[PDB]
Amino acid sequence: PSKAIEVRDLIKIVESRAISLIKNWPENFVLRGLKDAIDAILNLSPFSPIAEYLSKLERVFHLLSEWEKLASREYSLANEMDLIKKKIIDWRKFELSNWNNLLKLEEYKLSERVYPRLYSILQFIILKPFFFTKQNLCESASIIVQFITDLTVGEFQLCLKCLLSFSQHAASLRICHGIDAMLLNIYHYFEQFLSKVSEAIHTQKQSLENSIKERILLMSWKDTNVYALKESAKKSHAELFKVLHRYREVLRQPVSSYLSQKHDWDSLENNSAMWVAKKVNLSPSYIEKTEIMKLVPVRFSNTPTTLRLMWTLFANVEKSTFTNMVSNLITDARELMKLTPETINDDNLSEIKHLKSRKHLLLTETFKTLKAFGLQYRVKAGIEENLSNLRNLLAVIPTFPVLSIEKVDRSLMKSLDFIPKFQTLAGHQHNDLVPEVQKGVGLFNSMLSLQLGERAQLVEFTNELLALKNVYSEVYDHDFENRAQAVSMLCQIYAIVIQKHSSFQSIGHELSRFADLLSNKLFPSADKVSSIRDQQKGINDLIEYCRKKRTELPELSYCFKHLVSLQSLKDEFLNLMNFVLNLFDSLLSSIETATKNMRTFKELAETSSFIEMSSCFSKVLRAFNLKFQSMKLSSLKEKLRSSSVDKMSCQLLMLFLPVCEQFINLAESVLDYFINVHNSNLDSLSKISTLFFMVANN
């Protein structure tokens, strides 16, 4: 790449030798021609066009072949023509090496033309928000219009990634409220099944790889024909142009053409225990062995039985069933599809009669029991919002802040991908034995409405659990390390200036070793307090050593640097115990709400037709952790401005964080059980809906 300057330098040296040889010899043929050829070389500073300097070197090679083989048998050396021939042979080798992979050029040209359109589109869409809910549905329709409008595979993955990237880049922008959740649902449903388009692009790239291996294996070792390698060159250029048209046709299979799918069949961490009671080693030393931190009875008084009870709260929370019924229904639907798998006349004698009887009975019973037992009929005002208004419906998927939740998100993405076609499959139940397919679109909209209500309830429960997690995880020089980090940047700059010498940098490098402590001056975010005091002692010792550095070395700009661096070197106890009892009461309210509603959705789940189990599940999603967090933030604002009585303060504060952690651990056991049941129910509902749509088709 940059060796073209060296090639021009060798051309200049050889042309200097030849001009010295021909400067006094009169032939009127070699001198001015070779001088003009080298000046055409010397003016040439083109790089990216590899054939530009190669064509300049080719004209110079023609003039030098003239100047060498024509005259000046005593003066011209003619070996430089062979050296330039070897150079052009290496240039052809580099051209063939560039011909080993060349799709990236027009691929980057296409991606450059693509992402600027998406850039201007999101620029309009966000300068709307830069310089509401109806506007959100309007932007949802506009986003669907753009997703249909920018139909370009390859840049389609770049487009879903750009949706995620714009949502991330605008996620810190406070000019919107729920657009992050909207773009989350948008990129999620956008990433429903795009791996099919990815494999299609992979197959197109593999076919183009075979065609290019053909077009480049046809580029063979010429290794001759200096005046006539242009035949093989033009052959490769024509093969490149034809394969460029061929790859344009191969990529011309659209993503709107690839916007289809199919549905034939589908398939679908109960309790986690983890005690952090020993995770402190001082509060565990207290568990291994103070009046101030143990002064009065707060009526809990028994930690070991409570840890066994938290283990039992992890254990007995195993008590999905709708997912079990939907899985049984999917197995029976596969059996009914295999029930008419026999021949034409032989099956329709007796057995396909019973098979079609079971099929039409499953269709009519699906309609009647969908009207009866949950996802009820005789309601279609929400199918206008959900089955219809699908842009505004995908906007209306209220996403949570974000494993099993991610599995449920992918399941909802592919399920909404199917439900858009299934709502579009309204009007085909006459073969299923007419308007019952539109009724099934409405019942799927109702079941998805129940699912989205449970999803917003999961968002609420996840917000309560994240507040509890921040409370349990809320456990001197905080933000005093800002000047430390600035000095660390200055220390890295000083190490770079030590590298910028042109004999003494090793002391700077040792000072860069001192900058390791400056690296330690960004590090930690008991004996860590001693580590912080040691970092401050090293800071003082280095401020001395910076004076020692710029004193011993001249280091004048560094002396001004160290000058600016050394410049920039710069009662409520029993009330809290009653507040601890009241925060235990508010946490007991949280736990009693979650646990009672979970027992109602667990043991008495049978007294439901997809409703009362779901009602107790949303009631457990209405766990009163925000009241727990209310009393906890009350005691937190209490202890925050409060004075430090070390006979009560630090280890018991760490333990109150860890008692909240153990409560959150049993909560996360029950929550992972519920999230597993919810993800399983959503996925088995999607699989049963795929089987029901297959029964509706046949």
PDB file of C-alpha atoms in Angstrom, residues 181 184-185 188 393-402 404-413 415-416 446-464 613-615 617-622 674-675 677-679 681-683:
ATOM      1  CA  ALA A 181     -40.220   0.272  25.103  1.00  0.00           C
ATOM      2  CA  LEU A 184     -37.784  -2.535  22.042  1.00  0.00           C
ATOM      3  CA  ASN A 185     -40.962  -4.236  20.837  1.00  0.00           C
ATOM      4  CA  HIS A 188     -37.915  -7.593  18.965  1.00  0.00           C
ATOM      5  CA  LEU A 393     -50.759  -2.566  18.198  1.00  0.00           C
ATOM      6  CA  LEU A 394     -47.024  -3.222  18.003  1.00  0.00           C
ATOM      7  CA  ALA A 395     -46.672   0.220  19.531  1.00  0.00           C
ATOM      8  CA  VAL A 396     -49.250  -0.894  22.107  1.00  0.00           C
ATOM      9  CA  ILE A 397     -47.070  -3.780  23.266  1.00  0.00           C
ATOM     10  CA  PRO A 398     -45.926  -2.130  26.517  1.00  0.00           C
ATOM     11  CA  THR A 399     -42.413  -3.465  26.918  1.00  0.00           C
ATOM     12  CA  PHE A 400     -40.679  -3.848  30.257  1.00  0.00           C
ATOM     13  CA  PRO A 401     -37.252  -2.326  31.036  1.00  0.00           C
ATOM     14  CA  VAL A 402     -35.504  -5.307  29.433  1.00  0.00           C
ATOM     15  CA  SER A 404     -36.747 -16.760  30.571  1.00  0.00           C
ATOM     16  CA  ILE A 405     -37.980 -13.205  30.075  1.00  0.00           C
ATOM     17  CA  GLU A 406     -35.828 -13.049  26.933  1.00  0.00           C
ATOM     18  CA  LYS A 407     -37.246 -16.390  25.801  1.00  0.00           C
ATOM     19  CA  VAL A 408     -40.755 -15.015  26.382  1.00  0.00           C
ATOM     20  CA  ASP A 409     -39.771 -11.923  24.383  1.00  0.00           C
ATOM     21  CA  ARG A 410     -38.612 -14.001  21.410  1.00  0.00           C
ATOM     22  CA  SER A 411     -41.769 -16.117  21.765  1.00  0.00           C
ATOM     23  CA  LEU A 412     -43.959 -13.005  21.729  1.00  0.00           C
ATOM     24  CA  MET A 413     -42.009 -11.673  18.726  1.00  0.00           C
ATOM     25  CA  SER A 415     -46.143 -15.087  17.995  1.00  0.00           C
ATOM     26  CA  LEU A 416     -46.925 -11.532  16.900  1.00  0.00           C
ATOM     27  CA  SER A 446     -58.232 -11.331  23.346  1.00  0.00           C
ATOM     28  CA  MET A 447     -55.711 -13.968  24.464  1.00  0.00           C
ATOM     29  CA  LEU A 448     -52.892 -11.645  23.413  1.00  0.00           C
ATOM     30  CA  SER A 449     -54.627  -8.858  25.342  1.00  0.00           C
ATOM     31  CA  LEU A 450     -54.582 -11.046  28.458  1.00  0.00           C
ATOM     32  CA  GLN A 451     -50.931 -11.812  27.683  1.00  0.00           C
ATOM     33  CA  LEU A 452     -50.074  -8.114  27.294  1.00  0.00           C
ATOM     34  CA  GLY A 453     -51.847  -7.290  30.551  1.00  0.00           C
ATOM     35  CA  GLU A 454     -49.774  -9.975  32.249  1.00  0.00           C
ATOM     36  CA  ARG A 455     -46.717  -8.473  30.507  1.00  0.00           C
ATOM     37  CA  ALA A 456     -47.376  -4.985  31.855  1.00  0.00           C
ATOM     38  CA  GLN A 457     -48.003  -6.616  35.241  1.00  0.00           C
ATOM     39  CA  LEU A 458     -44.634  -8.342  34.826  1.00  0.00           C
ATOM     40  CA  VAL A 459     -43.104  -4.937  34.070  1.00  0.00           C
ATOM     41  CA  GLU A 460     -44.658  -3.632  37.305  1.00  0.00           C
ATOM     42  CA  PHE A 461     -43.470  -6.613  39.358  1.00  0.00           C
ATOM     43  CA  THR A 462     -40.027  -6.286  37.763  1.00  0.00           C
ATOM     44  CA  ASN A 463     -39.963  -2.611  38.731  1.00  0.00           C
ATOM     45  CA  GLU A 464     -40.880  -3.541  42.315  1.00  0.00           C
ATOM     46  CA  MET A 613     -54.943 -18.189  38.142  1.00  0.00           C
ATOM     47  CA  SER A 614     -54.120 -15.220  35.891  1.00  0.00           C
ATOM     48  CA  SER A 615     -55.847 -12.832  38.311  1.00  0.00           C
ATOM     49  CA  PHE A 617     -50.747 -13.973  39.048  1.00  0.00           C
ATOM     50  CA  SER A 618     -51.332 -10.284  38.334  1.00  0.00           C
ATOM     51  CA  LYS A 619     -52.069  -9.815  42.041  1.00  0.00           C
ATOM     52  CA  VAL A 620     -48.687 -11.376  42.794  1.00  0.00           C
ATOM     53  CA  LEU A 621     -47.381  -8.990  40.150  1.00  0.00           C
ATOM     54  CA  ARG A 622     -49.028  -6.346  42.352  1.00  0.00           C
ATOM     55  CA  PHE A 674     -43.788 -17.434  37.742  1.00  0.00           C
ATOM     56  CA  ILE A 675     -41.682 -16.171  34.815  1.00  0.00           C
ATOM     57  CA  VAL A 677     -44.771 -20.489  33.893  1.00  0.00           C
ATOM     58  CA  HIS A 678     -45.562 -17.282  31.984  1.00  0.00           C
ATOM     59  CA  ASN A 679     -42.967 -17.862  29.253  1.00  0.00           C
ATOM     60  CA  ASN A 681     -47.759 -20.362  28.713  1.00  0.00           C
ATOM     61  CA  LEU A 682     -46.940 -17.756  26.048  1.00  0.00           C
ATOM     62  CA  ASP A 683     -44.902 -20.228  23.995  1.00  0.00           C
TER      63      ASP A 683
END
